[PDB]
Structure formats: structure tokens, C-alpha cells
Amino acid sequence: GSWFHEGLSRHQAENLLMGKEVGFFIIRASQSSPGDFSISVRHEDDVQHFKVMRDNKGNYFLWTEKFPSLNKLVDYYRTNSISRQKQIFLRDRTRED
Amino acid sequence: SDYMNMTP
């Protein structure tokens, strides 16, 4: 598998992630901002979406924290909450894996 | 649509 499913729609990402554990996620091309990515993340009761923005140096960010690559952004949010309303960490393996 | 980190 892969984190990255560029062609998945927002609703398709919701459907896929409803079948996954909290913190599982997919990175897709944004429908609203076509040259950018969106990260969809399974929360406890639903799936929420984050826009991956770019600064004038080409860094990637969600909030204020900047990263030179999507990979570094993902790895940061394994340890730090991606959500400001709840504590949610990105995950991509089950506990049994 | 709606994104959690959309701010002005």
C-alpha cells in the first residue's frame, strides 16, 4: 500500500478511512486547491481533512510548523497531534503489525 | 470543502 492516493476524492477518502483505525490517513490531491495536497485522517467518529499548504520557499505545512517534504511532515505528526481540537497522531500500522 | 486547519 501507500499513504498517497492522489486521485482519491474527498468522499472516497472518507469511505476508505471509516474502515480503518483512529489515526490512519491518506494523502490525496486537493479538489479545492488543485496543485496542493489534502490529508484525510480517521478520528474517533468520523474522518476530518487538513489542507497541506505551501510557503514562498516551497515548505509544506498544516498549522505553523514547516517541513521541507511531505515525508517529514508525516513523520512529525506521528509524534505530535495533527489536530488542535483532539489529540490524534498519524498511524499506518496496526498494533499487531 | 471544510478543512480543520482553514484559518484566515
UniProtKB/Swiss-Prot annotation, chain A:
It comes from the Eukaryota. It is found in: Nucleus; Cytoplasm; Endosome. The modification N6-acetyllysine is found at K51. Residues 3-94 form the SH2 domain. Interacts with SLP-76 to regulate NF-AT activation. Binds to tyrosine-phosphorylated shc. Belongs to the GRB2/sem-5/DRK family. Interacts with phosphorylated LIME1 upon TCR activation. Interacts with phosphorylated LAT and LAX1 upon TCR activation. Interacts with SHB. Interacts with PTPN23. This is GRB2-related adapter protein 2. The chain holds residues 58 to 152 of 330 of the full protein.
UniProtKB/Swiss-Prot annotation, chain B:
Expressed in T-cells and plasma cells, but not in less mature B-cells. It comes from the Eukaryota. Phosphorylated by LCK. Dephosphorylated by PTPN11. Changing Y3F: Greatly reduced phosphorylation by LCK. The modification Phosphoserine is found at S1. The modification Phosphotyrosine is found at Y3. It is found in: Cell membrane. Homodimer; disulfide-linked. Interacts with DUSP14. Binds to CD80/B7-1 and CD86/B7-2/B70. Interacts with GRB2. Interacts with PIK3R1. Interacts with PRKCQ. Receptor that plays a role in T-cell activation, proliferation, survival and the maintenance of immune homeostasis. Functions not only as an amplifier of TCR signals but delivers unique signals that control intracellular biochemical events that alter the gene expression program of T-cells. Stimulation upon engagement of its cognate ligands CD80 or CD86 increases proliferation and expression of various cytokines in particular IL2 production in both CD4(+) and CD8(+) T-cell subsets. It is linked to Immunodeficiency 123 with HPV-related verrucosis: An autosomal recessive immunologic disorder characterized by susceptibility to human papilloma virus (HPV) infections and the development of HPV-related common verrucosis in the first decade of life. In some patients with HPV2 infection, warts may progress to severe generalized hyperkeratotic cutaneous papillomatosis with cutaneous horns ('tree-man' phenotype). In patients with HPV4 infection, warts remains stable and may even regress with age. This is T-cell-specific surface glycoprotein CD28. It comes from Homo sapiens. The chain holds residues 189 to 196 of 220 of the full protein.
